[PDB]
Design a protein around this ligand. Sequence first.
Ligand SMILES: CCC1=C(C)/C(=C/C2=NC(=C\c3[nH]c(/C=C4\NC(=O)[C@H](C)[C@H]4CC)c(C)c3CCC(=O)O)/C(CCC(=O)O)=C2C)NC1=O
Ligand SMILES: CCC1=C(C)/C(=C/C2=NC(=C\c3[nH]c(/C=C4\NC(=O)[C@H](C)[C@H]4CC)c(C)c3CCC(=O)O)/C(CCC(=O)O)=C2C)NC1=O
Ligand SMILES: CCC1=C(C)/C(=C/C2=NC(=C\c3[nH]c(/C=C4\NC(=O)[C@H](C)[C@H]4CC)c(C)c3CCC(=O)O)/C(CCC(=O)O)=C2C)NC1=O
Ligand SMILES: CCC1=C(C)/C(=C/C2=NC(=C\c3[nH]c(/C=C4\NC(=O)[C@H](C)[C@H]4CC)c(C)c3CCC(=O)O)/C(CCC(=O)O)=C2C)NC1=O
Ligand SMILES: CCC1=C(C)/C(=C/C2=NC(=C\c3[nH]c(/C=C4\NC(=O)[C@H](C)[C@H]4CC)c(C)c3CCC(=O)O)/C(CCC(=O)O)=C2C)NC1=O
Ligand SMILES: CCC1=C(C)/C(=C/C2=NC(=C\c3[nH]c(/C=C4\NC(=O)[C@H](C)[C@H]4CC)c(C)c3CCC(=O)O)/C(CCC(=O)O)=C2C)NC1=O
Ligand SMILES: CCC1=C(C)/C(=C/C2=NC(=C\c3[nH]c(/C=C4\NC(=O)[C@H](C)[C@H]4CC)c(C)c3CCC(=O)O)/C(CCC(=O)O)=C2C)NC1=O
Ligand SMILES: CCC1=C(C)/C(=C/C2=NC(=C\c3[nH]c(/C=C4\NC(=O)[C@H](C)[C@H]4CC)c(C)c3CCC(=O)O)/C(CCC(=O)O)=C2C)NC1=O
Lengths: 65, 160, 160, 160, 160, 147, 161, 161, 161, 161, 161
Amino acid sequence: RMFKITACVPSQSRIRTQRELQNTYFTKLVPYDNWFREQQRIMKMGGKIVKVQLATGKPGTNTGL
Amino acid sequence: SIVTKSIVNADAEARYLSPGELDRIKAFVTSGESRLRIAETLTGSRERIIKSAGDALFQKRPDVVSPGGNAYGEEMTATCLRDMDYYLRLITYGVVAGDVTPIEEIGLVGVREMYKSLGTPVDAVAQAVREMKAVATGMMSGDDAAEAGAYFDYVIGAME
Amino acid sequence: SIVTKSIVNADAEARYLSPGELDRIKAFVTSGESRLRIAETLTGSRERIIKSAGDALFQKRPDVVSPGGNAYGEEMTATCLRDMDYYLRLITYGVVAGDVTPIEEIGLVGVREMYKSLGTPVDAVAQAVREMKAVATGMMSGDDAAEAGAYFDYVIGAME
Amino acid sequence: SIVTKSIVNADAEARYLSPGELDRIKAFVTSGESRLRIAETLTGSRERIIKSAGDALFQKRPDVVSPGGNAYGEEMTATCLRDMDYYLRLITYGVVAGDVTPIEEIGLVGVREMYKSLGTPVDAVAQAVREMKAVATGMMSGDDAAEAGAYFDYVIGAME
Amino acid sequence: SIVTKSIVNADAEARYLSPGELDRIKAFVTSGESRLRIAETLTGSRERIIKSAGDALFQKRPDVVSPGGNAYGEEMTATCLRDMDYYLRLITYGVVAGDVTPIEEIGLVGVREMYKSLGTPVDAVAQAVREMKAVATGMMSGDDAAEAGAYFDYVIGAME
Amino acid sequence: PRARATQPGSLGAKVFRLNNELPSGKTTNVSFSESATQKVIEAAYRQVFGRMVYAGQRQKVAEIKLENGEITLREFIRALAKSDVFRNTYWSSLYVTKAVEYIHRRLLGRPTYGRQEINSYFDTCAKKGFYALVDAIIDSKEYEEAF
Amino acid sequence: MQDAITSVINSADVQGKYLDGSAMDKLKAYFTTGALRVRAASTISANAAAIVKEAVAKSLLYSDVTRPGGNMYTTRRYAACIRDLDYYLRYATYAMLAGDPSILDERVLNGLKETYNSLGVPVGSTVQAIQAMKEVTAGLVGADAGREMGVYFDYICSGLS
Amino acid sequence: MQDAITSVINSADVQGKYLDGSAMDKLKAYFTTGALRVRAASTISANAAAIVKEAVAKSLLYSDVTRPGGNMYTTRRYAACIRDLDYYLRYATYAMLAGDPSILDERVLNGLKETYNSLGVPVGSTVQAIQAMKEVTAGLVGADAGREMGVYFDYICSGLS
Amino acid sequence: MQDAITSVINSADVQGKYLDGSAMDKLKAYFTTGALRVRAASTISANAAAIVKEAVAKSLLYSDVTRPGGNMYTTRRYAACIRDLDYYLRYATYAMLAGDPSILDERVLNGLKETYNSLGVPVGSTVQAIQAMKEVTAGLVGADAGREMGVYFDYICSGLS
Amino acid sequence: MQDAITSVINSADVQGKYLDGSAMDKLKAYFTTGALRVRAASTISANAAAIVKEAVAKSLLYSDVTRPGGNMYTTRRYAACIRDLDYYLRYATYAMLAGDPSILDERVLNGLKETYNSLGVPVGSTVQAIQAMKEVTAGLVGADAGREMGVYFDYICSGLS
Amino acid sequence: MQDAITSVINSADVQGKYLDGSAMDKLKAYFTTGALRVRAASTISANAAAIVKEAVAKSLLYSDVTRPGGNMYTTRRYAACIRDLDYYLRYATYAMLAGDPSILDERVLNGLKETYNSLGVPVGSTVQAIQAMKEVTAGLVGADAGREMGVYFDYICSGLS
Ligand SMILES: CCC1=C(C)/C(=C/C2=NC(=C\c3[nH]c(/C=C4\NC(=O)[C@H](C)[C@H]4CC)c(C)c3CCC(=O)O)/C(CCC(=O)O)=C2C)NC1=O
Ligand SMILES: CCC1=C(C)/C(=C/C2=NC(=C\c3[nH]c(/C=C4\NC(=O)[C@H](C)[C@H]4CC)c(C)c3CCC(=O)O)/C(CCC(=O)O)=C2C)NC1=O
Ligand SMILES: CCC1=C(C)/C(=C/C2=NC(=C\c3[nH]c(/C=C4\NC(=O)[C@H](C)[C@H]4CC)c(C)c3CCC(=O)O)/C(CCC(=O)O)=C2C)NC1=O
Ligand SMILES: CCC1=C(C)/C(=C/C2=NC(=C\c3[nH]c(/C=C4\NC(=O)[C@H](C)[C@H]4CC)c(C)c3CCC(=O)O)/C(CCC(=O)O)=C2C)NC1=O
Ligand SMILES: CCC1=C(C)/C(=C/C2=NC(=C\c3[nH]c(/C=C4\NC(=O)[C@H](C)[C@H]4CC)c(C)c3CCC(=O)O)/C(CCC(=O)O)=C2C)NC1=O
Ligand SMILES: CCC1=C(C)/C(=C/C2=NC(=C\c3[nH]c(/C=C4\NC(=O)[C@H](C)[C@H]4CC)c(C)c3CCC(=O)O)/C(CCC(=O)O)=C2C)NC1=O
Ligand SMILES: CCC1=C(C)/C(=C/C2=NC(=C\c3[nH]c(/C=C4\NC(=O)[C@H](C)[C@H]4CC)c(C)c3CCC(=O)O)/C(CCC(=O)O)=C2C)NC1=O
Ligand SMILES: CCC1=C(C)/C(=C/C2=NC(=C\c3[nH]c(/C=C4\NC(=O)[C@H](C)[C@H]4CC)c(C)c3CCC(=O)O)/C(CCC(=O)O)=C2C)NC1=O
């Protein structure tokens, strides 16, 4: 169980010395058990979520994940 | 406002709002009429405040109106008064918000960087908001002058 | 003071003190504690008041310290700060006494004749007391700043 | 210095010094003779640098020496020239070390907090280092003036 | 150029050119590319140099832009910048010539007499070429800045 | 507290960033990108474990997922810290409170402040275990604000 | 994240004017609603667990979802369901306090749709549960604040559907 | 961390007793002094940087510690000294508002002696700096508010020494 | 990240041959350009802030962007705009020094398009600002290095559009 | 962490004086020895593993410590011993390059005695191993570079003992 | 407590081996340095109080620690400080005579850090006092006897820090 997500997250309150194209366009693989918490984090910064899809095991797997 | 700031505080601490800050929001709710009166009087006399404060700033610091300075010419002085208009507008927004956060979001993040780009001396802008503060608190009653001077004081503190 | 003024005003009228004047004296007697607190606030920080007010005055009115002005030179600037110290002392006396008869009866009657005989611009002295008022009411709480600013207001009003 | 910076930058990375860093240290080791010549040029004529730079600064920014400014009076102007002497000494240290970690690690980290606690305008200090840079690069050959002006440039950049 | 000056020197001394000055002409011949690069960068950024130098001059010396001064009004300030254009043009001519003699022939013989006629303060023009020198050497690399600053230095030396 | 994120310069340790994002399809042989990514993986291995781990013990699956760019550096450090070699080294040899303190000094870069902070992390160790301890340290707002 | 106050300040800021009298009218409207908003928020914060348990007992309990074959069958999915409902109620209370549904569009309905499509969560059962929770909180805290919670619950349902 | 009210409640609770007349009298004393505490806290919040810079101008300036070799020499050390004095004034204001010095030995005086002894910070010079800060703020807020500030300033100097 | 040298080595490496004479020809071409590349890089590094301020004063200042209603209105967006321009100029200087636009495709134009679509940044104003910056740096550092900066600024614009 | 240059600057700064002739002479001594330091550092970076394995082959091999019961017995302990010796050689190279042993007591000799005493590591056997490492590298880089390596090796052995 | 002879015998006994040539060479080194150790010990026994009072006159006098608030303030604290410095010089003389610092960590450095941390004694100021004592006695007994005194003085300062 793992969610592939891609998202755009803007800088909240300061100018940045670093480049941070990778910080602003985040595409990564988030496991299921921390996905509620990481979604909450993305919403806590204020950036939007562009895609959510689980590429791993099927939705419906009661036994075995 | 104070409610967004209390909400992001209760969010980062991952708890509900404490009854202290519920009482804080309730007291802000009851003091809405006083802040409406302050912002009403400021939106009333904005031109007189800007004219007296700009002439006091040009009397205090003549480097900006001198040749070679930043605000030299008719359009440059008019843009200087336009920037003072924007800052008094944000002062009224923060006065009616109960918090300094809309002043922070709209006009306090990169003012040093953008005024480094334009060539504006930022301490002259701090003197301009100082004169606007002195004139606006000269207009208000002393308790309401203390409230508006808190936000004006915050702006000149974030300037210099 | 308040008691002197009430006694004299009943004294010309050939009557005793009216009960309204008596509760006036009673309310002043009760508010004497806050008056003494304002007096300690003004007394203990006189160095910073005189220093910062002289700095802001000479920033605001630089011609009196330029060659040609009255307070030009070392001893003349020292005498200028001494005159400001005199007026802050009279402000403390008027704060304690509850009325402006110490301030008026000591240092405001022939102030125009004296400063005309010295060659001094009296508007710049009013600006000196204005900067003293700014530093002093920047130093206290709200009602304390209002009660001290009443006497500072009387001094600047009696200048012009 | 250069050797400290290369050692630390290889030290966090858990590796030895890369050969490019090693020829960097080698080139700095060879250019140390010209660095010592620039240091003797800056050291031997410090009196004229501090004197002429203070003269041009107080000509350029006369309000800080006028009554009301920070460096008003005999001992205050002496302390102002002492602060300029401190910064020229740190310039000499940064010239010898080949990097700005002496200058930053001694006299540039909390410079804003210190000069805000003293009541000093930091732009006038940047003008003081600007006049020191003008007198110092007026004192040397071309590449020597460029190499010293790099560190003078870093000090004025770290002011604002 | 250097060749005309070496020729008039060998003519007045009535001999052929010495191998020292033949080697000087040969070294000038080989350094033609560096002086072409310097004059190229100066002819590139002449407007920015003139604008920053004119605003720095008006910030330094406000007597010329004041009422009653020389360069008062739109056309007078434009003619002031035109004279700075002529002097930067002669600076580029002398930079590409390898000698100061075309600057002497075109714009250094009677500048005191003609500016006595027009009423222009000549020391203000020396300050203007000083600001043009500081800005142009701020633009160049340090060795080429030393070369261009030699000719700029010669112009301000012949001014004052 | 605004300057939790500001890195120290020349007075503290150097900070390693993964900012280049190792991006390549049809990569050059002398591409400089993989080498800097190896530097950052090197740095994470020696900040989490302290030392460079022995050759049979390092995780190649998390290195591969980082160099392909599906997991962040935070999740890579979470996968390094939730490994068996880390817990057999630091969590299984020591007392539980000393393990809380040393894992906090490893993953947050500082010792703990007081008792609430230790009563809250060792409660996460109580009802859920060591994996939720690493999960709660990596969750914390000081980690997000600092790194 | 904006209040009624921050949205008023924002709207007066985009066009660039100062505070006009109509802005003060909206601000006093917000305050005279905000006192009872506070009391309703305290009542909802006091009784949130009973509100959620009455919502699931009203709509989701004796259906196929809480039964086998539904997406609410296992205890993992039941705990996730109760957590989803608690989060809907909490964010509706935040939107009621702020007087603006921008928080619901900002934090709730941001990527909730696509994860609800991807996990196979039924949208209709969630919408029924939220509406049951809506009239549960309406019968709890009162009529006008019931309408307040009603438009924010309806905002959540419209962003969900 | 406890004020006068929480310490009175903690004493009556560790007893297990109800609040008797002595506790009522202690709380009446705190509820009479609280308005003076509030006004002194506002007046101290007005002039933080002025009180700190006047304390350095009284004690630490023009002495050996700002000269080369002193521990207040560099700009980093000067900024850290101003930071430490701002901490002492801020926590003395907090202990004045609470009416109990429990925050001072909980959050200032906990590892401060060992920190200053490890760094090489002079404890006598910083005790004199805190004493001058006390003298300046007692000149600022008056006699009795200056005394109730100076009791916690003396607490900080006693725990530091 | 490849230079002209590293791209030559890379191309000779994929086909598998040693260094041929045509590779040496490209290498000497790179060196005879690289001397003036160094001097132009020093000139751009000296005057970067004036270059960026002249670029925004040329194109972006008195338009609707720096006005209200544009994406450059607030000071947050203005500071982000100046930072974006500084980064374009710095990476163009790196590409000029390396002699290869692989750094611009590697670090600048990697995900810049989609975040510029997602934040609503106007592509046309950015392209105008970059071209204004291009002839500003061309008038500053000279003709041939102006062309050098020109093809790398054009590479940034083509990756942006 | 400071080299000879930074320590000279720190002495002249703690004095508050300018760099006089003795400091100039010290820096001239370091700038004469620096090329030899560079070449010895390259030669030591060449043969790290060879110097370490020759030090173990001289001292620790075929003794009791590699036998059962010794602290170098297991493969984990052998690998940690090779790691510790590589640390000593690497930091001795760093202290040779800096010309100052401040990095050694900052970053090696800080808690090393207490660590080795808590683990049960023999300090005399590791001192003999560092001495054999010194002997091997002094055979490698020559007389005077071996001496300026051995002064920091003796510093490590003195701080360890 | 063991000198160089007893440590050599203990190493050869823990080996179980006889005294081989390396042990003979170590004992020959000690038996060559022993006369210099004896003469330096006599010269240090000559001037105990002078070395101690010159160390205080160099470091601790006229600083903040002898002023009010310092830990060397009172006459009791001054006498205990002179006692502590006499202890450091006496045990450094003993460790110089033995040629082994085992007596220092057996009988000085055992609980000294915890004692000084419990009392509030500054460790940096006493480390500077021991360093000045080392400087004075190295000026007293010469170069190499001063060095073999300073190795044990540095041992005491390292164990104290
Ligand atoms: C090293 C390569 C690199 C680039 C270029 C980069 C750009 C970048 N530009 C951004 C924003 C921005 N960029 C602009 C740009 C402009 N202002 C305009 O209107 C014009 C069209 C243009 C000025 C020339 C603006 C206005 C924002 C902020 C919009 C917002 O989020 O509020 C952001 C979002 C975070 C932030 O606020 O800075 C990133 C990551 N990141 C990188 O790593
Ligand atoms: C609400 C937040 C906010 C701020 C702060 C703001 C500033 C701002 N100041 C500007 C110009 C300016 N502002 C000044 C102001 C000054 N220079 C002086 O001499 C005076 C001392 C000082 C006045 C206090 C001047 C002279 C210009 C014109 C600069 C130029 O044209 O080069 C412009 C360019 C014109 C435009 O697009 O309206 C902006 C955007 N805009 C904002 O939206
Ligand atoms: C308590 C009531 C009281 C007042 C006010 C007072 C004023 C007073 N001010 C004096 C001088 C002065 N006072 C000033 C003051 C000023 N000039 C300026 O430009 C500033 C605007 C201003 C002060 C801020 C100066 C410059 C002199 C010297 C006049 C001279 O030397 O001719 C003198 C003459 C010298 C002396 O004996 O001190 C008196 C008596 N004496 C009193 O008993
Ligand atoms: C090596 C790094 C370093 C710096 C920079 C430093 C500065 C420093 N400047 C001071 C004062 C000062 N420095 C100035 C300097 C200036 N005021 C002006 O108007 C001018 C713009 C400017 C100098 C050109 C003045 C006026 C004071 C006195 C402040 C006062 O008396 O309140 C003081 C307090 C008195 C003292 O002990 O000297 C320190 C510590 N100390 C350091 O260790
Ligand atoms: C290449 C050699 C060369 C020089 C030097 C030169 C100077 C020159 N300067 C002129 C005017 C002027 N030049 C100035 C310049 C100045 N006054 C100021 O306030 C400034 C400080 C100073 C500028 C540096 C002014 C104000 C005028 C107009 C004077 C008038 O109209 O009365 C004019 C009259 C207009 C014309 O025929 O173009 C000439 C010929 N011409 C030459 O061919
Ligand atoms: C396989 C994992 C699994 C579990 C554990 C599970 C529990 C479960 N227990 C339920 C009800 C219930 N379960 C109980 C059981 C109890 N209360 C008591 O008095 C007894 C002591 C205790 C019996 C041991 C009761 C009384 C209800 C009805 C609660 C109600 O209607 O309010 C329901 C609601 C009806 C439904 O949708 O079938 C579910 C889903 N479902 C699952 O799929
Ligand atoms: C703050 C805004 C916010 C929300 C709302 C949110 C929801 C959210 N709901 C989830 C799952 C879920 N949500 C439900 C919902 C329901 N049960 C049903 O069948 C009904 C239709 C509905 C009950 C009312 C279920 C069953 C799952 C778990 C399905 C699974 O992954 O096994 C998950 C996947 C992780 C998890 O298992 O919890 C997220 C992230 N995340 C957020 O950040
Ligand atoms: C960079 C400064 C620095 C040093 C030097 C350092 C040493 C250090 N050496 C260690 C272990 C060790 N060190 C040794 C080394 C030896 N034992 C012997 O018998 C030999 C005489 C000697 C090798 C020559 C051994 C065998 C261990 C492992 C102990 C064990 O696993 O029980 C440990 C225990 C934790 C771990 O292995 O990874 C540390 C922290 N740490 C540092 O940060």
